Structures are given as C-alpha cells and as structure tokens.
Amino acid sequence: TTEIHPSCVTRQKVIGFGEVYKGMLKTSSGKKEVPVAIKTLKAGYTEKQRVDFLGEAGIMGQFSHHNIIRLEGVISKYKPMMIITEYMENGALDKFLREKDGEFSVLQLVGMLRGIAAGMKYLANMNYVHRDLAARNILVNSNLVCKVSDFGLSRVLEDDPEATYTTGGKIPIRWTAPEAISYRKFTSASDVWSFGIVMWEVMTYGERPYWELSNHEVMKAINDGFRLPTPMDCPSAIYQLMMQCWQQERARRPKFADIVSILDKLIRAPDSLKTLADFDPVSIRLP
Ligand SMILES: Cc1cccc(Cl)c1NC(=O)c1cnc(Nc2cccc(C(=O)Nc3cccc(N)c3)c2)s1
C-alpha cells in the first residue's frame, strides 16, 4: 500500500464519514498525472472507523485485476486521511443503467456481465467472499468496463462480529442467498446467487429486484420457490444462467469459472443470444 504525499493530490469536485471527490494525482516522481477518485475520513473518526477505512484500502491493494477497482494509495500520515483510486467516469452501475434505459445492445449488456463475472472469479479464487454484490457496488468507466468495489475487513477476519453486516447496516436481503440470510453461511456460492441478481439488474436496466415486495415478502417468495421472471428482450441462455445461480442448494449453483466460460461462449457465437426467453406480460387487447 503506497503512502501518497498530500502535495501530490488535488481535489476538483465533490461526487459523493467524509466525502468522495474527483481529483488529480501526480505520480512517478512528478512525471505523470492521472485522474482519481478520493475518499476522505473527517476528524473525530473512531478507532473502528479508522480500522474499517484503512482496511478497505488494504484489501483493495491486494488485488490486481482489470475488473476490480484499482487502488492508487492512501494518505494516512496527514489529515484528513484519504483513499485514492482510479476514477470511474460513469459511476455506479445501477444508476448508470437507470439513466441509459434501453440504450445498449444485448451484446453490450452481456459483455458487462462477463467483466463483472471475471472480477468475481478473481475474488473467489483469492478466497475473498464479497457478501454485498449488487449493481450499486459495481462502477463503470468511460469505456463501459465494469469493476467490482466495496471491500472490508469484516469479510476476511475470522469470526468477525460484523461479518454479516454491510461495510454496519443490514445487507439488503434481496441480493442474498437463502442460506446466508437464514444461517449466515456466506461463501462464494452465496456470491453466485447475488451475481444472478446482478444479471437481472443489468438486463432490466436497473430495475429493483422483486419490485414493491417487502423484505419478508421476498423471503416468502424465494422460500416458496418463486424466482424473478425473465427481463424483457432477454436471451433464453442468459435467463437460464441466472436461474442456475438461484438454485436453492448451493452445491448446484455454477462456480464463477463456469459463469465466465458460458458468457464467453455466448459472446463468441452471438447467434446463440437471438433465442429469447418469453417475456411474461398486462392485458391490452386490440384487433
Ligand atoms: C476513492 C475510493 C475509496 C474507496 C473505495 C472506492 Cl470504490 C473509491 N472509489 C470510488 O468511490 C469511486 C471511483 N470512481 C467513482 N466515480 C464516480 C462516482 C459517482 C459519480 C460519478 C459520476 O460522475 N457519474 C457520472 C457523471 C456524469 C455522467 C455519468 N454517466 C456518470 C463517478 S467513485
């Protein structure tokens, strides 16, 4: 983890306790300058807040993959402390899709999912269980590359008392596998369930999983065997894959390597994506 000197960081604009800014980072001993995102931790933070803040950077610094947000470094010796990452111009994937409804091709959407799956395969192979995979935690750059974010020590430390929470609130249950909800059994296979929900988010341009259903209503539906219906204009192969991510039995779910492989094969033979799942309709009746 690279300690960055504050003289190398300028903040240009607020984009999101503390704040998140867009800024510039001078690197390579003053010879290079790159756009960055900058998250601060304001004075008065608690020990827990510090350990969680620097812990997310420490975890991010362990990864090096095209589909995982890249850490530039941290400012810990000066205040306010900062975490500095690459800047993703299009922000969170759920909002991005909700502002771009219907504008992408099926192949583009499937390619986004392949990138997310590659990042998740990498995480799982590192023995990192994400526990909060959702489109809100995926960022998108100007070239439409999707990268996983949102990391924390409660996911790796042994029997961490906060392992079942978000990086401190309740993990929104509608992305979470039944065995993680009911028994706190979070594993890469529960991340696969979440990935299936992300596939549905992507193919619907950011629809809310399960619409108006309350959390208890979602639990009722899933435990009765209900599953989210196909998105509109969705390839049958893509819907079949998300259904397999949602198998009740975790051992029946695909591994991330399987997901990456299948998505690759579909993209490479794109006629395979022209078979669409039937969209289950409202009754509008005309001649
Ligand atoms: C700095 C940091 C510390 C710890 C964890 C993480 Cl993941 C990060 N990094 C970031 O939070 C971010 C990296 N890149 C970000 N980009 C971002 C976030 C929110 C909004 C925007 C933005 O400007 N979105 C936008 C603006 C205009 C048009 C479109 N399509 C999208 C861009 S936020």
From Swiss-Prot:
Documented effect of changing residue 39 to M: Loss of kinase activity
Keyword Transmembrane helix in annotation: yes
SUBUNIT field: Homodimer. Interacts with SLA. Interacts (phosphorylated form) with VAV2, VAV3 and PI3-kinase p85 subunit (PIK3R1, PIK3R2 or PIK3R3); critical for the EFNA1-induced activation of RAC1 which stimulates cell migration. Interacts with INPPL1; regulates activated EPHA2 endocytosis and degradation. Interacts (inactivated form) with PTK2/FAK1 and interacts (EFNA1 ligand-activated form) with PTPN11; regulates integrin-mediated adhesion. Interacts with ARHGEF16, DOCK4 and ELMO2; mediates ligand-independent activation of RAC1 which stimulates cell migration. (Microbial infection) Interacts with human herpes virus 8/HHV-8 glycoprotein L/gL and glycoprotein H/gH heterodimer; this interaction triggers EPHA2 phosphorylation and endocytosis, allowing virus entry.
Protein name: Ephrin type-A receptor 2
UniProt keywords, alphabetically: Angiogenesis, Apoptosis, ATP-binding, Cataract, Cell adhesion, Cell junction, Cell membrane, Cell projection, Differentiation, Disease variant, Disulfide bond, Glycoprotein, Host cell receptor for virus entry, Host-virus interaction, Kinase, Membrane, Nucleotide-binding, Phosphoprotein, Receptor, Repeat, Signal, Transferase, Transmembrane, Transmembrane helix, Tyrosine-protein kinase, Ubl conjugation
Any Gene Ontology CC annotation: tight junction
Tissue expr: Expressed in brain and glioma tissue and glioma cell lines (at protein level). Expressed most highly in tissues that contain a high proportion of epithelial cells, e.g. skin, intestine, lung, and ovary.
Protein family membership: Belongs to the protein kinase superfamily. Tyr protein kinase family. Ephrin receptor subfamily.
Side of membrane Cytoplasmic, spans: 1-287
Residues the entry annotates as binding ATP: 15-20, 39
Shown chain mapped onto the complete sequence: 605 to 896 of 976
One MF annotation (Gene Ontology) recorded for this entry: growth factor binding
Record: disease: Cataract 6, multiple types: An opacification of the crystalline lens of the eye that frequently results in visual impairment or blindness. Opacities vary in morphology, are often confined to a portion of the lens, and may be static or progressive. CTRCT6 includes posterior polar and age-related cortical cataracts, among others. Posterior polar cataract is a subcapsular opacity, usually disk-shaped, located at the back of the lens. Age-related cortical cataract is a developmental punctate opacity restricted to the cortex. Overexpressed in several cancer types and promotes malignancy.
Gene name of this polypeptide: EPHA2
Annotated source species: Homo sapiens
Positions bearing Phosphoserine: 261, 283
